């Protein structure tokens with residue numbers, strides 16, 4: 001059945017499992033097909049967040065199969081943000097604001113469906129380059145959202161907050177916001193702020209000279225060491241740099 005409705009094209013990336021470009025046979029709609037080995041949570045999380053729309057900041061799930069294979073939308077043309085930055089350098093504050101804005105709303109959306117992505121990072125933001133639009137991908141390591149802390153966590157280390165590194169403490173919202181701060185620093189500076197555990201734990205920020213102080217202040221807020229010092233998502237949207 002899979003091989004009846006869909007044709008796998010080139011490998012696009014191989015942790016998540018593996019993602020391919022493909023087409024849906026009947027109408028040659030372009031899709032991405034994500035293969036996983038060993039029903040997975042990702043399908044459920046994608047369902048919850050897709051259901052009735054749901055959001056333009058989130059890649060839609062279109063179909064899934066056992067043999068596990070997920071059929072995802074594929075904007076044409078598209079590039080993840082990591083590769084974009086590799087090729088083009090930091091986004092610069094005007095387009096970061098817009099993309100950062102979109103990511104935050106996608107995250108808010110997800111939280112509204114009770115889903116925490118838990119792996120926000122630039123490899124996981126797809127830029128749909130026709131519409132000028134960021135989309136969240138890769139829910140393979142997300143969870144259902146709760147007040148209660150986690151240790152279910154298997155994220156990307158360099159986007160993980162100090163209290164996870166130090167205490168194995170994962171609080172969904174503060175850890176999300178921490179990762180947003182990493183991402184934003186990524187976007188405007190062209191690299192992550194902290195490469196090693198020790199750097200995360202110290203959390204010391206040295207901004208390149210080109211980063212505006214407005215952008216600095218927001219990033220410092222998101223990357224506060226103590227998780228309760230961190231803004232909520234609404235505070236971030238209301239930050240003066242975000243206007």
Ligand SMILES: O=C(Nc1cnccc1O[C@H]1CCNC1)c1csc(-c2c(F)cccc2F)n1
Pocket residue numbers: 012013016019031032034059072073074075078079080123124126137138139140
């Ligand atoms: O779901 C996706 N991706 C993903 C999911 N789940 C886990 C990992 C995923 O991606 C990996 C490759 C790029 N970043 C991580 C996805 C949908 S469309 C797409 C995509 C594209 F349309 C053009 C170029 C590169 C692309 F990736 N990707």
